[PDB]
């Protein structure tokens, strides 16, 4: 759809869309940029993630509202609540499938540096996790396993190639811990992962500049917030 627009113009318009809080547009611009076939820079990977995370985040919030109404209804309200929850769910699945398709064609396979590869495998884990949040059919177990496998490959690379304070490594651990707690029914694994991540980052803060320290400690506090919620 964006095939006739220059890559650089798509990137510029994605930045404008973010400033205007037009995240659906932002995602469409970034999909067009990825489809140009060139690798993405660090900044461009963040535009891609911000756009889709905000789109799917709104769908998730709406799905949860509708799913709560539907569960309470189960006086006869008719088929409408279930139909509308299904509509939002199908839309959400479609966005996740689109993101997974960009990662598979061909972002992950060309990503050789640890920072890019970990970033994309973390995203893959996240969008399978969002599919798992709404899954109930014969493929639920396979969707959960696909998230697990992507996060695990990202973790293995991150532990070999990045310091324990690296923000991508920290955010990956944060999200994989949420996977364990909320999806995999493994709260102890979630707590263990968050605490070991936090403690190993703490012990490496001394190596960091003021700005890197600020970034790492911000994510450490997110880990701590979850640990406080879970314990």
């Amino acid at each position: 759809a964006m095939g006739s627009m220059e890559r650089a113009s798509l990137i510029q318009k994605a930045k404008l869309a973010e400033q205007a809080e037009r995240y659906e547009d932002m995602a469409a611009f970034m999909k067009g940029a990825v489809e140009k076939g060139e690798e993405l820079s660090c900044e461009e990977r963040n535009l891609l993630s911000v756009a889709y995370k905000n789109v799917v985040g709104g769908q998730r919030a709406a799905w949860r509202v509708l799913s709560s109404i539907e569960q309470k209804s189960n006086e006869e309200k008719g088929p409408e609540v279930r139909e509308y929850r299904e509509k939002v769910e199908t839309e959400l699945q479609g966005v996740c499938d689109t993101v997974l398709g960009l990662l598979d064609s061909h972002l992950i396979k060309e990503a050789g540096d640890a920072e890019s590869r970990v970033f994309y495998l973390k995203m893959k884990g996240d969008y399978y996790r969002y599919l798992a949040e709404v899954a109930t059919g014969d493929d639920k177990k396979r969707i959960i396993d696909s998230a697990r496998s992507a996060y695990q490959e990202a973790m293995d690379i991150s532990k070999k190639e990045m310091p324990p304070t690296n923000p991508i490594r920290l955010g990956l651990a944060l999200n994989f811990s949420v996977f364990h707690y909320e999806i995999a029914n493994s709260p102890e694994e979630a707590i263990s992962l968050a605490k070991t991540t936090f403690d190993e980052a703490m012990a490496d803060l001394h190596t960091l500049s003021e700005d890197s320290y600020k970034d790492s400690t911000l994510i450490m506090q997110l880990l701590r917030d979850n640990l406080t919620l879970w314990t």
């Binding site: 963040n46 993630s49 995370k53 811990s177 949420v178 707690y181 909320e182 979850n226 919620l229």
Partner: peptide, 9 residues
């Protein structure tokens, strides 16, 4: 529980 945000804020 919270996952990573898209931006620092």
């Amino acid at each position: 529980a919270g996952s990573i945000p898209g931006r620092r804020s």
